[PDB]
Design a protein around this nucleic acid. Sequence first.
RNA 1: GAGGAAUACCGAUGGCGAAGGCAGCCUUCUGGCAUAAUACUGACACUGAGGCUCGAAAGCGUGGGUAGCAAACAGGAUUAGAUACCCUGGUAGUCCACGCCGUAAACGAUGUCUACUAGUCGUUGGGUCCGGACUUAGUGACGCAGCUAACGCAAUAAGUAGACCGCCUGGGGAGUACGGCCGCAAGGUUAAAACUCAAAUGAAUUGACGGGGGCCCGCACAAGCGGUGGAGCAUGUUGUUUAAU
Lengths: 152, 105, 57, 114
Amino acid sequence: PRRRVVATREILPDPKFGSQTIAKFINHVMSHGKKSTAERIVYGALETVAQKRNIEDPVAFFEDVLENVRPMVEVKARRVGGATYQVPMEVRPSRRTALAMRWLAEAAAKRSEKSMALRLAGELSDASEGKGNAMKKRDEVHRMADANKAFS
Amino acid sequence: MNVTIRGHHITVTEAMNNAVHDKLTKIARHFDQIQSIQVILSLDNSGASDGGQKSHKAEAIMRVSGQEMFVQALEDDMYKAINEMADKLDRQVSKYKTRLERNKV
Amino acid sequence: PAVKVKENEPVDIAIRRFKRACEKAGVLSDVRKREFYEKPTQVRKRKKAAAVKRYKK
Amino acid sequence: VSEGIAHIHASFNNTIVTITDRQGNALAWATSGGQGFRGSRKSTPFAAQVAAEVAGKAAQEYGVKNIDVLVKGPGPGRESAVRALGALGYKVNSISDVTPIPHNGCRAPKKRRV
RNA sequence: GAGGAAUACCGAUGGCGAAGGCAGCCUUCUGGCAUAAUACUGACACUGAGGCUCGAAAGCGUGGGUAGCAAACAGGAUUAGAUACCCUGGUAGUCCACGCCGUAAACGAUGUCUACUAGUCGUUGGGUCCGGACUUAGUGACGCAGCUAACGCAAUAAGUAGACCGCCUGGGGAGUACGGCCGCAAGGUUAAAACUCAAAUGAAUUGACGGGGGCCCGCACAAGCGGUGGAGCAUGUUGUUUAAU
């Protein structure tokens, strides 16, 4: 805002795993302020993947898929002499996680499973192995970032 | 591209509608990127201390993709107001079109 | 503008030396002078403006 | 052929790097317009970098190891090409700039009225 | 290998020339200038209507030459169109010889020649003294007095005066017509009137504006979340309809 670096708010960890990453994902899924609702979908999907894969640490599994999902290079719209060529830069660490979470939620929003918990569980399972629309979008971002690879 | 022709405090006639439509389609011939046109023909005063000379008004609010240009013209006669409004609108269309075309180089 | 890169010398520092020698020879200014034809009246105008600027320091 | 000369004909639009032998017999050549870069990307130091890699590695079959580069032109890709050639196993003997300059010879084209 | 043209660097509010102009290097022919001293002529001077000479570029005639560039021209783009700007080509011309042409914002928008009037700092060619000092002919940047509507000029005056010559007398019509003269031509030069309008101008001031510059701000954009625009209904307006809406 052509001004100072306004300080970011303090997120409160979710009650179950006590992880700020899961709290941030809960906020991402939540709409209309229904935090309890989003908590219940996020917990249902995480429990479903934990049971299906028989993994003791759902938060560690989620951290693994999140780190596997978040990109490394993005493309921005620069301007030199009224020209629009896309410049590949390195995503800032704060933006990496937000982009990954938003991609996961928006990819799980268009699955064929009955409930959003099931859709999110399926998307998490696919992203843990490197499939799904989240990986598709991340690879489509890397495709542009490497197919420019000439504007700094 | 829309064309609305409203009339405030005056009864817009078929002749007024033609006299605005013919010039609107003339500007829309050279510029094909117009989204909407709204022309208000008004009688904003009675000329009680100046004897007309600005008694009729013709204003055109046109909207293009990413910009909105408004012009107005006061005159004693509504047809002359319409023509002066149309000329200002044509000049502004030409100005925007040439700026956009010269932004590429 | 030839730079003879020596043994055990990185290509990076050798190219920095080559850039320094090309500036020393003023090669790219010579190339830029012939991009287009500059009319003698424009040449004299440019040189007199440069002379005024040089003398005002 | 062990000993060779790189010729980086850099230009504002395109950069052409060709490796020949001492007597100016071309071995391999690669440009930036024939590497997947067209228009705006062709006039970029990275395009000259990949053209230099393609040409140098394609001339390494002949067995050239010691190369002296000859840069010619004002193009952006006249240092990145040398860097790509050098950091590909080549041994740079010298880096000479040989772009032609007229001693007030032929008349230049008219100034662009953009 | 052929050919034509131009002469990078040096290069410089540098130099030379009456201006126009004149850049690789060498020779031949040749003009002016600057400088020291002595000797000499003894007013031989200044300016100058007409006249003559010279006079960029483009252009013209004849005969050559012809690389690059490039009017015209051809095509491709851009665009509503694009007889343009941009791109690819391209002939005249540009170059040479000999003749025309006689015009340019041919400008310092400042006629020539004299004398006199604070100063300061550069620079080019000399000269004389003790690395400096003085002096000369230029060529620049400042800056008093003075002048100027103001801008500004200010020993290279637009100051103070003098000699002679040229020119102006509102803006258009019009540097046009007609008539001469010149020119191969293009055209030049000399040069009106009727009519028309009450302004047209210069410098400067305050704004406003700029596809001028610099700096900054606002959910202005960017980064996001949610909508409007599609459906049905509520509501207001246009329009239409009505006796009135």
